[PDB]
Amino acid sequence: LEEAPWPPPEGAFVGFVLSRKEPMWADLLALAAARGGRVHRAPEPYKALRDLKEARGLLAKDLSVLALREGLGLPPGDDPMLLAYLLDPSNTTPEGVARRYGGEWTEEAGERAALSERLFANLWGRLEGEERLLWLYREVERPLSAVLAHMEATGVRLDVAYLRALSLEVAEEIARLEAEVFRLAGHPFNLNSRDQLERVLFDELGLPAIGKTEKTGKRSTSAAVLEALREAHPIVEKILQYRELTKLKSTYIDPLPDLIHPRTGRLHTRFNQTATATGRLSSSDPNLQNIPVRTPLGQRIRRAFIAEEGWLLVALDYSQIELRVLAHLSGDENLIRVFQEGRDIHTETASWMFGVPREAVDPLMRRAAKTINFGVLYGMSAHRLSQELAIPYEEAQAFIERYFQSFPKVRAWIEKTLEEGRRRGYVETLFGRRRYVPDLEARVKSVREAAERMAFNMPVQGTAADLMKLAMVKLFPRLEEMGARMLLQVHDELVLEAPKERAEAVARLAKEVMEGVYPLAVPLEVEVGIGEDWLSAKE
DNA sequence: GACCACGGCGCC
DNA sequence: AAAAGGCGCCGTGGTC
Ligand SMILES: C#Cc1ccc(C#Cc2cn([C@H]3C[C@H](O)[C@@H](COP(=O)(O)OP(=O)(O)OP(=O)(O)O)O3)c(=O)[nH]c2=O)cc1
Ligand SMILES: [Mg+2]
Ligand SMILES: [Mg+2]
Ligand SMILES: [Mg+2]
Secondary structure (H helix, E strand, O other): OEEEOOOOOOOOEEEEEEOOOOOOOOOEEEEEEEOOOEEEEOOOHHHHHHHOOOEOOOOHHHHHHHHHHOOOOOOEOOOHHHHHHHHOOOOOOHHHHHHHHOOOOOOOHHHHHHHHHHHHHHHHHHOOOOHHHHHHHHHHHHHHHHHHHHHHHHOEEEOHHHHHHHHHHHHHHHHHHHHHHHHHHOOOOOOOOHHHHHHHHHHHOOOOOOOEOOOOOOEOOOHHHHHHOOOOOHHHHHHHHHHHHHHHHHHHHOOHHHHOOOOOOEEOOEEEOOOOOOOOOEEEOOOOOOOOOOOHHHHHHHOOEEOOOOEEEEEEEEOOHHHHHHHHHHOOHHHHHHHHOOOOHHHHHHHHHHOOOHHHOOHHHHHHHHHHHHHHHOOOOHHHHHHHHOOOHHHHHHHHHHHHHHOOHHHHHHHHHHHHHHHHOEEEOOOOOEEEOHHHHOOOHHHHHHHHHHHHHHHHHHHHHHHHHHHHHHHHHHHHHHOOEEEEEOOOEEEEEEEHHHHHHHHHHHHHHHHOOOOOOOOOOEEEEEEOEHHHHOO
């Protein structure tokens, strides 16, 4: 390429180098742009940012996030990563995409700029003819990246002093548990070490081993194994409680408070847009899509996520979402009838599980049933079901049989989906998002059958993902106009932040936009709650 | 210090 | 553990 002076022309492709991967924390080391066999390198990267109309290139969102941090409204535009991911969602890294589509991901801004332009040309040409993938790029993914940038740069408030106080309390409980565990073992050991614990449990206490680990074939000490051993020795229960507290303390209570950004006073995750096989987003550094909620200590941690003073959080969550999608994809009359009648599959399974009438099902009962409902849908074995519910094997077998016989077309849809996946080599969502599954043709049954479960799940989980993404795209401009904020997406859930005076109107609006995102053969319902913290905002 | 495979486990 | 699918992070034991 030929060196030309900064600034580049309009529509040029950017390349930039960060001191670290997280845009909210990085120093902008270098910045460059490329167009028309020219490369323009910027003397002063930060000042050079004021010269761009949009971030166009590999990882566009990240530079946009950094620009937003510095008070610059630089929106992300075309990004070759998005094109590659739509062509084949195994395209997840710039290193991989470069190797596959025509260059090398280096550590130099100018080469990265030239690389962005080359890759965009090639990938765009491969997208020609693919009208449905084109529709997803222009109407969903590309504008979505703008929305995600604003979400990352805005972040979410955390009650730091609360978490610190909670730490000290949980530290003391952990000490009680480990001390009791050592007493029962007769000696101390590293309780955090599953190799040491296995020896204690199965060699010293002579407990029966239940299962083996995958790669190394050791005797498993997982929660499920321990659960099976709960009656066998008093140490087991203590170990389960220890596992829960230390998981929560080391993963959330201790690290979160140290991640508060000095400028914003808030927590800033990254919303990774090309990271899953199904079209879901992922969240990292920190992951805020896996904040605890299910156990009492977990709920206490979730409370730490709060609104700015004078504002309220609004949480909206699609009802039974993948079941609704499955009703649309499969066309099962019975399943459609369920939703047109306003019924609840989770609640109904809960009624069976606990042996109570539908009217007498508490939220806890309904929620334990959700894990059962999807486990079965996506292929859980009778054996596992019987062990999870502590019922006889043949009772678990019966539940699974009735489950599919009551929704007769679901199995037909699965069979069609797999058949089509064998011929084409890929499966797709309602909007044409593809996932390649070559192992549908594998000659080893266990491999083929795992491939099959991956394959028929993808259209369902992926269609739900498409709907959520499209809804964020439609919702975002409305919120800006109302002076409200989009903070987090947790798969089928959105968390917003609204001025207290408008929290209610924002809630109503958001609900309507999400339920009407894309009319199906069944209604989409959204549960919405409002509160001063994340826990109270989901009731 | 930084990486890794692994088992394990938090959320959807 | 197990014929659920999809993620990212943690500590240990280990290397470099
Ligand atoms: C307390 C509690 C609690 C919270 C969440 C779950 C869960 C879940 C799962 C969700 N999913 C998919 C299908 C779900 O429809 C989708 C969204 O999860 P989620 O919002 O929790 O459930 P869903 O929408 O079906 O019902 P909802 O309670 O009406 O929201 O993610 C799974 O594939 N497997 C699961 O185990 C289980 C218990
Ligand atoms: Mg839901
Ligand atoms: Mg949800
Ligand atoms: Mg170490």
